[PDB]
Amino acid sequence: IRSNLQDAKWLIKSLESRNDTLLRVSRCIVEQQQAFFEQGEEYMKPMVLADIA
Amino acid sequence: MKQGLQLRLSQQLAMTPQLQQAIRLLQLSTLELQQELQQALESNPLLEQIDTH
Amino acid sequence: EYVFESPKMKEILEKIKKISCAECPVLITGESGVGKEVVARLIHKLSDRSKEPFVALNVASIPRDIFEAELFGYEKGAFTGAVSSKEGFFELADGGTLFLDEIGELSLEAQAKLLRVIESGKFYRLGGRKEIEVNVRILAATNRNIKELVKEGKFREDLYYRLGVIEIEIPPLRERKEDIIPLANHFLKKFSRKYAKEVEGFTKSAQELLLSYPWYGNVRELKNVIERAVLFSEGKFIDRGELSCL
Amino acid sequence: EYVFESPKMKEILEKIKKISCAECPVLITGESGVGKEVVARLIHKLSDRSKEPFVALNVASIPRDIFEAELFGYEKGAFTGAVSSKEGFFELADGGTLFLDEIGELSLEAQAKLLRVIESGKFYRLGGRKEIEVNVRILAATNRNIKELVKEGKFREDLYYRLGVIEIEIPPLRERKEDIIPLANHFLKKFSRKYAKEVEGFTKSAQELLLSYPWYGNVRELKNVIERAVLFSEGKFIDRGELSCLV
Amino acid sequence: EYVFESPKMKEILEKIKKISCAECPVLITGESGVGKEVVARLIHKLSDRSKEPFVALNVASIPRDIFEAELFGYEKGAFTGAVSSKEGFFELADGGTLFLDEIGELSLEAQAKLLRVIESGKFYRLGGRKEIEVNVRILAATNRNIKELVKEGKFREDLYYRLGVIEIEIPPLRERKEDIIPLANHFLKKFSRKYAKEVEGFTKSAQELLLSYPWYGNVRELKNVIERAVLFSEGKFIDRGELSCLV
Amino acid sequence: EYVFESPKMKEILEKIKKISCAECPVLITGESGVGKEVVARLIHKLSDRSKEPFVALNVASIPRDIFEAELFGYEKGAFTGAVSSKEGFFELADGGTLFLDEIGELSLEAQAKLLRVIESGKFYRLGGRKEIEVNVRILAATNRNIKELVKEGKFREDLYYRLGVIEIEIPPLRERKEDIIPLANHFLKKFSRKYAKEVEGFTKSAQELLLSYPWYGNVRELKNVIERAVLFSEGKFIDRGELSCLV
Amino acid sequence: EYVFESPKMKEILEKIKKISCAECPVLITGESGVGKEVVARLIHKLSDRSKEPFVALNVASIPRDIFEAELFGYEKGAFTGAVSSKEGFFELADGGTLFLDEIGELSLEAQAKLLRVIESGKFYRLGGRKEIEVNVRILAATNRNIKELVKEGKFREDLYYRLGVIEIEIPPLRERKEDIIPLANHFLKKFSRKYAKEVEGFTKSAQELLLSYPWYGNVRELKNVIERAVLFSEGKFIDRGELSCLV
Amino acid sequence: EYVFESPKMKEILEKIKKISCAECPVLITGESGVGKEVVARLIHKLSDRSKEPFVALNVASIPRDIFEAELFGYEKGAFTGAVSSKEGFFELADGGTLFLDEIGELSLEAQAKLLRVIESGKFYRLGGRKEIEVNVRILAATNRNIKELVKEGKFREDLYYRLGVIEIEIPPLRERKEDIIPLANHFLKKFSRKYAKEVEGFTKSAQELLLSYPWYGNVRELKNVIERAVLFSEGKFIDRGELSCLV
Ligand SMILES: Nc1ncnc2c1ncn2[C@@H]1O[C@H](COP(=O)(O)OP(=O)(O)OP(=O)(O)O)[C@@H](O)[C@H]1O
Ligand SMILES: Nc1ncnc2c1ncn2[C@@H]1O[C@H](COP(=O)(O)OP(=O)(O)OP(=O)(O)O)[C@@H](O)[C@H]1O
Ligand SMILES: Nc1ncnc2c1ncn2[C@@H]1O[C@H](COP(=O)(O)OP(=O)(O)OP(=O)(O)O)[C@@H](O)[C@H]1O
Ligand SMILES: Nc1ncnc2c1ncn2[C@@H]1O[C@H](COP(=O)(O)OP(=O)(O)OP(=O)(O)O)[C@@H](O)[C@H]1O
Ligand SMILES: Nc1ncnc2c1ncn2[C@@H]1O[C@H](COP(=O)(O)OP(=O)(O)OP(=O)(O)O)[C@@H](O)[C@H]1O
Ligand SMILES: Nc1ncnc2c1ncn2[C@@H]1O[C@H](COP(=O)(O)OP(=O)(O)OP(=O)(O)O)[C@@H](O)[C@H]1O
Ligand SMILES: [Mg+2]
Ligand SMILES: [Mg+2]
């Protein structure tokens, strides 16, 4: 019971961390490309993984 | 001075990696993540998912 | 599926059957290619340990400095690099059969390490303080002459009497002349089926030629010759020409 | 359970009974299969430590690079990979006896790690700064001739005198003619009971054949011969023809 | 592309064609420079494993003490310094071909380790308790008379019959005088293209000198001579003077 | 508790009493079983630091790979597995005496690590960055001719002159003819009290045989012979027939 | 910088400049001191790899037990001691030229370990499972007649045919009767420039002694003697007395 | 206080005064107990860096597997168990002097690692990234013949020629006979006051043997002899009879 409980806790923590990371990265991406959502394309900015990282 | 396979008591400085665990969950999409969660639920008796039945 | 037609090779089969109720170690001797592995596996099959593991170990392929670690195992912290406990081969073959193939190529230093495990079955793991007891039947096979080696002084005397409770010696193929033709037919059928050929027998000259060659590799050499003959065969009967390799 | 009938094997039993109260190390010598371990366990059983551990150790199967760790143990942090304190065979056998089997196979560099522990009984664990004292009785068995090796130079002189306080030598079976027939009958009864056969005894010709064979494996070889004879028997009396392996 | 013109070479080629449907071990013998590796690679190409690995291994450059670890592999805690599991060469070439080059230099102690693997195909790693089964075809090459070594006693008899299921012997260039001029022309064209010279062929006297010479290095020596002649040539034809290395 | 009736042992005792005030290292040489450890402990007891630790080490039982850690200590984090700081045998014996037993069995590479601690007494730990100074008297005992070892090149010359400031050699028991009778009686009494026997002394013939026999184990062999005589004795006096068969 | 004056030296220079476009292995044979290493470095300079490393290795001086590890390198965890990866000489000289000094002194067993690498150029690092491919030009130097050595059976025939594509010989000073004076003058003026000496040239008397005195160390001993004479010089001109003092 | 009363030693002292100002590594040479430590400490004392730290080190006491970690330091997390960041010896002695006793015991890898920092002058910590300058004055000493070491190959030629900028070789005491008498009295006054003895001088006969005995231990052996003579002799003067046994 104890081993399975600790494994369950670890899995739940991993899921929470994954969701938080996804939210942070998506919010940063949206913040970087702020003129796209107001005027569509022709206003994209050139960005790579290094900028978000 | 020699190249052999031996068992001995030595004093050494050891390096080791610490990354690989829980990183596979980031690349998976939502559907594959749910499938893996179901597979984890099957084997762990202490994990449950919210139901409305 | 095996061939036992010679008078010498049927007394051996009867003796193998008669020792089915025993658990004493067995020592098998002969030349190369006589069928020591066949006899060992037949001994294992016709006993009460039929469903138990059969661990075949080439004792000349284990490094000198990790012999004890391989044979007995070790506990955690025994040496630098022992991160977890690991069992040996005597625990792996527990309840079954351990076949120490080619025991004659073991150095005198390595012969003194398995001197107490054969008779008692009790030992200590490397870094372990509790004593482990196992139930393993030991078969050994060699192409040397262990008695002559002991007389010379390059084989330990205390190991020969621990191993040689039952001794079986397999005669060379050049003296089991009643088995040459059945073995030839068996191998011919096998190889003709495997390679999808049309050969189904030997001529009279080929049979007379197979009954006089002094087979040095014995059954293995006979098998190789039959395989070569089948691969290069053209017609439906193997003539004397195809057996010029003799 | 054991057979002691010959006159030479009764003075050995009397000596064993005489040294019951002692604690000095014992050295046992003799050919292969004469009964060295039988004598060692009999010595242990007939002493005041009869309810204490009997640690039988084959000194030929201990690697030379970890030898000191096996006999003396170590403490946590002694080396890389040492995560917990572990005891040795000298501390495991405290209060009982330690039986060094085949002591003649020990290398010269491995014989120098024992000199201070055979006599004094005090040592330090690997990485330990506290002295440890144990009470262990040391029995040693070998089939070599240590007196010859010491003069030759393959055995240390200062270890032979530490180990060799009481020396017991067991004569070969070919010089124990009064033991052959009782041992043969004892083995026959044991193996006939184990294999559920219907064998009862030997024939006079077989007995005469047994008393003339110059046994080289001694009691172990006799035991193997009797087991073979029992396994392949059909009648009630074993005949000279069945013992054809001796000739 | 390679040149096979002598009747013996064509017979060897036909044998290679015939044995293309089998997976038996092959043993190649000859002198130095006859083309043993060419034959081995041709056998690999014409077989069913043409797209599979061809692991060529020089068995004389493997240290004696780590011979087992190179061919079988080891687990994580096999010995001090072992950090991770690693495969051997019998598991790296699974499903393909293993070419043991210069097998005649293997010592008997090293030869004893290759007995069961060649026939059975199953083994245990160093420190592994699970039996690994592989499917590898064995080609072996040597320039020493293996039969003479076995008769003398320098080569194990248990390995010759395991390896020598099919045996191919390549004749020396001294017995392939129908194969010399095409090889000379091939090498001449190759080196003229490589070094951008202007030579085109040999004179009649040069051809006679080439054909009359008892080559001891065989094709390798012929190639070296042709390369030197091309490098030091100045004229349109390689006359008898440029071939002054030959005696 | 000890017998020093022989004139040579009297002179050695006088020399021991003469150097009580000094602190220079002492080197003790002799055969096996002559009493080197007795002399070392007497030297420690007669000195001014007699109430301080007497750390006795067997330098043949310290592993080669951790010689520096067991002799100087280490700081935490010095290597993988060094979870806490430890002291060495030089700091454990600080203010007292360090005895090195069987120093002739020390490898040539391990003798270079003692060059600066013996002379000056200052060293660094493993991973430590501050100098540690200790005051330790050093005694070394060996049963080999150390000068011959230096001449033959198996012992470092720069270490012999650091150790052998004062050299004491103990004559063998073959030359201490005056000590044979007392050392026997003493031992006799001791054993006659340990096993509760009725033995009271030797006959004149037994004393003559004791004096005649050339002892090869010296006092240790004398102890063994007397203990064997006492164990099997049945009577008030020990006769020639018992120790004669013992020797 | 180097001085080539003898007609044989000019012929060797022409040969070197002619084979500048080649990549074949080169063999050099001659007595010690003739300048084989200078010839090899000149060949490297004029080749297409003038901007690439020139690795020089003395194979005879490599210890046997590690001979492979120096040449091929090893992977991590290959054996007890392979804490980190390493690269061998064949991988250091990738794209450059590898010079093998004293190739004639190589053991008969070691030569068989270099058979494939010289020809194919591919190898496996000890403990590695991927094939390493390099492009290295092989220059070799020997002090003995290699053909006679092979006929003696002391040298591998296969290695000789792999190395000997283009072979060069350098006569000693006993045949080079014309370079002695220019070499002596060049050495004298170079040492005068180095030490800022007053020396300006040799007298007529001293010149004859150099031709009279036979040379065994050849250019090396000539340079050493001239440098020592320069160190002994105290005037602007040197007479025969200073030179005759050494010999 | 030290004794310098020999022209060969007085000129060495003058060279010390002419070298102490320089900032280049120095290499001392001599036999055992010639005064290398004295020379190094005098060099440090007479220089402007006298107030700066003087770190003496024994390179044979540094374990191999941690050698560089002890000599250059490491940062946090460099290896498992690294609980803190520790500086090396090059950073502990910054602006002062680093003495490396017995420089002949370094392995080839250690020599290369030391030579890298000696030449370049900068190094990186084991787990660090920033670079550190040396600002270290390096002194080395040994008793082995460095020329024989480099000729054999145990010592790197580059390291020796880099350290060979300044060389000081103390002659053996057998060549400094005029210094024998002043040394002994210097010891005689030191020990006599230390042990409260009333000995004040030697006899004329005693001094004759001092100048006639070859001193293999040089100064250390003479000091040992004087200490023994002071400790044992109890007269006003030391006579040749007392020294007869010692010498
Ligand atoms: N009686 C038989 N019937 C059929 N095949 C046989 C017989 N005897 C031997 N063989 C065949 O001969 C070949 C060689 O036999 P085996 O491996 O037992 O020989 P060995 O040299 O005694 O053994 P090893 O060296 O492996 O201990 C095998 O392929 C086996 O199948
Ligand atoms: N007196 C006896 N009575 C019964 N069996 C005996 C007797 N003496 C010896 N044996 C038998 O002899 C066999 C071998 O004896 P043992 O193990 O003592 O031999 P060893 O070679 O001297 O010993 P070890 O090598 O293990 O030190 C045992 O199976 C034992 O039962
Ligand atoms: N028939 C051929 N056509 C073209 N080239 C050939 C032919 N036979 C051999 N060669 C060439 O000869 C050279 C040497 O042959 P190879 O490498 O096969 O030698 P080998 O038999 O393995 O020699 P060794 O026993 O000395 O190792 C190779 O470069 C190969 O290309
Ligand atoms: N004068 C003496 N009086 C009593 N017993 C003595 C005397 N001299 C020596 N012994 C005994 O001699 C025995 C031999 O042991 P000891 O340690 O002295 O010998 P050793 O071989 O010189 O020592 P080691 O090799 O351990 O340094 C001891 O048990 C000691 O009691
Ligand atoms: N022709 C030359 N012109 C100028 N210097 C030369 C000439 N030949 C040799 N030397 C000098 O000879 C010196 C020693 O000879 P070198 O080591 O180059 O040749 P070697 O004796 O053949 O080789 P090795 O010493 O490597 O076995 C070199 O430093 C080089 O300057
Ligand atoms: N000039 C001197 N005057 C007086 N004493 C001296 C002199 N030189 C050396 N000593 C003595 O030398 C002793 C120590 O010797 P030192 O440390 O110089 O030896 P070493 O040459 O370094 O030895 P090793 O190379 O064997 O380690 C000291 O006791 C010191 O008094
Ligand atoms: Mg080849
Ligand atoms: Mg010094």
UniProtKB/Swiss-Prot annotation, chain A:
The protein's superkingdom reads Bacteria
Coiled-coil regions listed in the entry:
none
Q: Which cysteines are joined by disulfide bonds?
A: none
Q: What does this protein do?
A: Sigma factors are initiation factors that promote the attachment of RNA polymerase to specific initiation sites and are then released. This sigma factor is responsible for the expression of enzymes involved in arginine catabolism. The open complex (sigma-54 and core RNA polymerase) serves as the receptor for the receipt of the melting signal from the remotely bound activator protein GlnG(NtrC).
* Similarity annotation: Belongs to the sigma-54 factor family.
Q: What is this protein called?
A: RNA polymerase sigma-54 factor
Section covered of the full-length record: 319 to 371 of 477
